[PDB]
Amino acid sequence: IFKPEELRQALMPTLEALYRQDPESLPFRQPVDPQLLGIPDYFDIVKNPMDLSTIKRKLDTGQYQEPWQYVDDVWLMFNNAWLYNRKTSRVYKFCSKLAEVFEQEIDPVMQSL
Amino acid sequence: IFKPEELRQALMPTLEALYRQDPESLPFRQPVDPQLLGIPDYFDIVKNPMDLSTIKRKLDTGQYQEPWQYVDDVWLMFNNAWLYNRKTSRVYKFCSKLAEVFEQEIDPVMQSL
Ligand SMILES: CC(=O)n1cc(C(=O)Nc2cc(CO[C@H]3CCCCO3)cc(C(=O)O)c2)c2ccccc21
Ligand SMILES: CC(=O)n1cc(C(=O)Nc2cc(CO[C@H]3CCCCO3)cc(C(=O)O)c2)c2ccccc21
């Protein structure tokens, strides 16, 4: 039993704190476009894309029933980037920065719920 | 014989240093849109518009043959902004800061190649 308008109250500050990271969030504010980014093999590796805009729209439009689905999506987005990208690349490091932030934002919110 | 991914690795640090200027890079991260910004004389004054998202695209999709073409697109972006906006304007002052930064990051990079 979980309602998605309280989930907005509860979880959106955590999402907002990822968007707040600048410039680290910018490669995550939109879906990965493999041709435009010059990474045509992206979907030979990643099979479930995720990004901040998809996560925000799902919060905004009730596609999250429980809060662990939001959490798993946020980790899917980061995992994808750690899976595809080189460890020395800026996008990898940006991923690790957002992940750090996300871990500290999300714990008290989830310990509450 | 500069290969696309060689230019991308060498030059993209300088593009990151531009994005890291907040708020100064904010008006430069997407193409100037006259309707949305209410400036219908923009294209009567600026003929070769340039912005960070275009420059990034060209680097991502190997559209630069040599480093001086990138350096040219960055300066074109600055010169358009100084040309169009009044000296007292936020956009002009922001531009000035982005150029002082770029000058400091482009130096070791061009020598290095
Ligand atoms: C999510 C993901 O894995 N990626 C995301 C990439 C990427 O550059 N995304 C990106 C990055 C940016 C701007 O990010 C800046 C951040 C500072 C470094 C210069 O780029 C804008 C957009 C967009 O408006 O569509 C997209 C990317 C590039 C190469 C390999 C992987 C990439
Ligand atoms: C590059 C250029 O010449 N311009 C860039 C202008 C501009 O404000 N672009 C802009 C600027 C911003 C960010 O605006 C910031 C500016 C500083 C902090 C307050 O918000 C976002 C967008 C967008 O959402 O597309 C666009 C602009 C406005 C008037 C005249 C010229 C302008």
Side-chain angles (χ1 to χ4, degrees), chain B residues 10-33:
Chain B
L11 296 175
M12 196 71 71
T14 72
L15 197 61
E16 193 195 334
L18 294 178
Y19 279 91
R20 278 193 189 282
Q21 312 310 298
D22 189 3
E24 290 87 356
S25 72
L26 293 185
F28 297 92
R29 287 171 179 188
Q30 58 292 308
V32 175
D33 184 19

Side-chain angles (χ1 to χ4, degrees), chain B residues 23 26-27 30 32 37 39 42 84-85 90-91 94:
Chain B
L26 293 185
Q30 58 292 308
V32 175
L37 302 173
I39 47 169
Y42 186 77
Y84 180 75
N85 304 272
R90 101 194 60 180
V91 177
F94 284 9

Side-chain angles (χ1 to χ4, degrees), chain A residues 76-113:
Chain A
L76 178 57
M77 172 176 63
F78 294 148
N79 190 103
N80 282 342
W82 287 323
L83 181 56
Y84 181 79
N85 295 277
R86 292 159 197 194
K87 299 179 173 58
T88 60
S89 70
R90 285 152 20 256
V91 172
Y92 199 98
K93 291 172 200 323
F94 288 9
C95 187
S96 299
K97 174 51 142 179
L98 301 186
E100 171 162 62
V101 168
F102 180 58
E103 281 178 325
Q104 52 215 5
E105 291 298 301
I106 201 60
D107 179 60
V109 172
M110 293 297 291
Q111 281 214 42
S112 153
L113 309 185

Side-chain angles (χ1 to χ4, degrees), chain A residues 2-42:
Chain A
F2 257 116
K3 141 182 155 201
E5 291 57 37
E6 292 148 310
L7 295 190
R8 276 219 311 278
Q9 267 158 352
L11 311 179
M12 187 66 77
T14 70
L15 194 65
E16 278 160 341
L18 307 185
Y19 278 97
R20 183 172 317 129
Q21 314 310 305
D22 187 313
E24 295 85 355
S25 79
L26 302 182
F28 306 91
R29 299 189 178 179
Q30 62 294 308
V32 169
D33 197 322
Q35 288 279 55
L36 260 183
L37 296 181
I39 43 161
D41 68 321
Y42 188 75

